[PDB]
Amino acid sequence: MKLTPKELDKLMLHYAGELAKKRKEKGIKLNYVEAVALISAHIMEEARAGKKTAAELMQEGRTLLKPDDVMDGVASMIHEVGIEAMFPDGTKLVTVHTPIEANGKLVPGELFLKNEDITINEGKKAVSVKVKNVGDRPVQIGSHFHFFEVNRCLDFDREKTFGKRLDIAAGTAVRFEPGEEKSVELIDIGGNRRIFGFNALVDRQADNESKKIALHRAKERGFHGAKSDDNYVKTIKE
């Protein structure tokens, strides 16, 4: 029976589960592991019998342990239980979300952040800009992305956006449904203000003069809102 290391992994897990079930049975509040296992182990058999579906087990797993079954803290700990089992249609990932609940007051590593708010991008004079997606597909722009160089579909005043990024939480972004129109918030790029890459429009220092070029290239490259070439005077490098 050519046993794949994957299979052994499970055969092990399974019994990790059996112990678990066998313990509460004898009336004992299950802990982190014990819960996790149990939950997991279940799905594995359920997938075996080939009855329940993934969508289902994903849910039914939330009905395996009552808040009075596990130890105080366990509930909060298991944010979720991921486990792949082999269904007649093939292996699948059953992700069981929050299988138990806060029937207790204890929460390991709980957070006591001090109320109040943090101000993103301190003193950074923002600016609003109309932005409509004139394309058939959606477009998500990011925090520190040179807005000016966004997809050649977001129609807006590139000129007003040169050297700036969506004034938002570092990391996140903004979505544009084909057609959708909005007014984004965008502050200037800090640091040395050295734009390099993206759509190859700048690749230099954010200068009011470098700008001329970007605006020119975007025109030729087709980005909506990229003004026009009012008799452009070429430079010796661009």
Q: Which residue is it, tokens 């050519």?
A: 2
Which 176-235 residues touch its own copies, going by CB under 8 A? 199-200, 217, 220-222, 233-235
Whether residue 6 contacts residue 33, with contact meaning beta carbons closer than 8 Å, is answered with: no
Which 42-81 residues touch its own copies, going by CB under 8 A? none
- Residue 29 or 212: which CB sits closer to its own copies? 212
d(C-alpha 80, C-alpha 59), whole Å: 12
Q: From its own copies, another protein, none, which one binds at residue 172 (CB under 5 to 8 Å depending on kind)?
A: another protein
d(C-alpha 209, C-alpha 221), whole Å: 19
Minimal distance, residue 222 CB to its own copies, in Å? 4
Minimal distance, residue 231 CB to its own copies, in Å? 9
Q: From another protein, its own copies, none, which one binds at residue 179 (CB under 5 to 8 Å depending on kind)?
A: none
Minimal distance, residue 233 CB to another protein, in Å? 10
Chain contacts with another protein (rule: CB under 8 A): 172-175, 178, 191-194, 196-200, 203-207, 209-210, 235-238
Does residue 236 touch its own copies according to CB under 8 A? yes
Minimal distance, residue 218 CB to its own copies, in Å? 10
Minimal distance, residue 225 CB to its own copies, in Å? 15
- Residue 94 or 226: which CB sits closer to its own copies? 226
Q: From another protein, its own copies, none, which one binds at residue 220 (CB under 5 to 8 Å depending on kind)?
A: its own copies
Minimal distance, residue 227 CB to its own copies, in Å? 15
d(C-alpha 138, C-alpha 178), whole Å: 5
DSSP string for residues in the chain: ----HHHHHHHHHHHHHHHHHHHHHTS--B-HHHHHHHHHHHHHHHHHTT-S-HHHHHHHGGGS--TTTB-TTHHHH-SEEEEEEEETTEEEEEEEE--S---SS--TT-----SS---TTSS----EEEEEE-SSS-EEEETTS-GGGS-TTEES-HHHHTTEEE-SSTT-EEEE-TT-EEEEEEEEP-TT-EE-STTSS--EE--HHHHHHHHHHHHHHT-TT----SS----S--
Q: From its own copies, another protein, none, which one binds at residue 228 (CB under 5 to 8 Å depending on kind)?
A: none
Two structure tokens written together for 141: 């722009």
- Residue 24 or 204: which CB sits closer to another protein? 204
- Residue 3 or 236: which CB sits closer to another protein? 236
List contacts with its own copies (CB under 8 A): 199-200, 217, 220-222, 233-236
